[PDB]
Design a protein around this ligand. Structure first.
Ligand SMILES: [Mg+2]
Lengths: 310, 306
């Protein structure tokens, strides 16, 4: 293993992301313009980790351990080692709201480690390493690649064998935007997959196959089809049971023609459009205690090298 | 939840520990005179965690997340809340070498949390909390109570929720010392070798020897040798840990009560007189870092700023 020098420092800016996008359960992801910023500096000894981003008076954020584990895993894959690390995080991605906070933290750490080692790893390797941690693969890929992505896993059966995680970028039309409606409750709990059935009808499976295909063309060239492409029968009807309020916001929005869907497993409802959502709709959400984020589709994780080369 | 004051600071000193002690697998534990120091201070905002203690040029140490996890769980149990934490660790307990570094970090965090919240927790609660992170109350209880301890990881209450962890102090003879032989290995998943079943006769053996061991620790150090014999984990770990198993055997073949500390790779010897240099230096040649330890007292918490 090559030893990296004291003073080497990078600054990683990683976007959050939204998964599923309606019918694209465990496969589609969309990077969003809300960011965690992770500075990593090689120091002579010790591990120093700082995490900031919570409101005044509130309890400290999560993910510091996740960023560290990801940095370690990246350094290993880069065949590099360090005598010491200082890690400083400014996290703006809302956590446990279905906006890809954990996945982004893993991506930041792998990408930081890669930058520190002068970038020996490929994008494909970064997607592999970051996806293996806590956050889902469709989120991690979005945070790495930017834009909209298709992701998939090959469960290697010879034998253990960690799964392959792969992803490819979609083209997104430049005028598509994303508006998040983020409720307060840290719920949903991990009982949103205990609600997913073991069996579905062939007809419903068929339905999702065609609507995910429609969603992909909607994203790339037909934003008038976003409403059709965000229909789902594989996960949202079941999760609606657990998130009755989020479901009412999605239904209300969809009934008015908005391409609304459940962000990941919730409770955030996301709306994709080419025009801004009307003020009255957004202020109604805000008065109800729902945070409104008027976001852009984000580009890829960015790694800036702070320490000059000589 | 009650909000604790900004500027309150505690300093926790925690001992490492040795588990099993031969036959007392997942039960016996002994606190040892090598320490971690954890300072925790409530600050206005954010989380700041620092861990130091590795040698010059070495990769940084583990356990910073464990200490934080433990502090959180201790704050929850104390029904306390904080706006921010500064956590600084100086660790001397060698990690992944059977000397209870992980468990001590958990103990440090819960104890720091307890002290920050003005000590509303009982000793028994602190054992429960800190043992939960490891599933190894023998190490955890040792670091909390000090001395030697008997712990029962069982009461897996009940089907299914959080198992209860408890322990009680043994009184150790004052002239009993511990000499650790640390290979300067430790590849994990070490229950490869732990079988699903074992013969009633081998089970018979350990039950009698852990009992001999308790008496040996309390009043008869001449029985340490007999008390440290095992047939429930050490012959199986001997497969994955040779050199360790050979240092154990050639020490037991002389006048010495040697056992596998935790799961290894450290070999530990309990005795009442110092081990001869004419054997220690023979170990230091073969890559072994020799550590002469005493039995430690309980985790200590200083409130350095009210
Ligand atoms: Mg994963």
């Amino acid at each position: 293993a090559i030893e990296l020098n004291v003073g080497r420092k990078v600054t990683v800016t990683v976007p959050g992301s939204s998964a599923n996008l309606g019918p694209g359960f465990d496969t589609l992801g969309l990077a969003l313009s809300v960011y965690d910023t992770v500075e990593v500096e090689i120091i002579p000894s010790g591990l120093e980790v700082e995490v900031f981003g919570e409101g005044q008076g509130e309890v400290p954020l999560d993910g510091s351990h996740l960023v560290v584990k990801a940095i370690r895993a990246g350094l290993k894959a880069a065949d590099a080692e360090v005598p010491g690390l200082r890690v400083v995080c400014h996290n703006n991605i809302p956590q446990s709201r279905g906006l890809g906070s954990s996945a982004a933290a893993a991506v930041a750490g792998v990408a930081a480690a890669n930058g520190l080692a002068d970038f020996p790893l490929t994008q494909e390797q970064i997607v592999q390493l970051s996806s293996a941690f806590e956050g889902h693969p469709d989120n991690a890929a979005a945070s790495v690649l930017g834009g909209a992505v298709v992701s998939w896993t090959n469960l290697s059966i010879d034998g253990k064998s960690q799964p392959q995680y792969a992803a490819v970028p979609l083209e997104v039309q430049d005028n598509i935007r994303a508006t998040a409606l983020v409720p307060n409750f840290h719920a949903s709990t991990e009982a949103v997959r205990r609600v997913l059935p073991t069996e579905v009808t062939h007809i419903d499976a068929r339905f999702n196959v065609s609507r995910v295909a429609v969603m992909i063309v909607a994203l790339q060239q037909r934003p008038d089809l976003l409403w059709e492409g965000t229909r789902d029968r594989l996960h949202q009807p079941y999760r609606a049971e657990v998130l009755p309020i989020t479901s009412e916001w999605v239904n209300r929005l969809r009934n008015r023609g908005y391409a609304a869907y459940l962000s990941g497993a919730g409770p955030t409802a996301m709306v994709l459009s080419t025009e801004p959502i009307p003020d009255k709709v957004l202020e109604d959400a805000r008065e109800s205690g729902i945070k409104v984020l008027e976001l852009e589709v984000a580009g890829p994780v960015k790694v800036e090298v702070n320490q000059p080369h000589h």
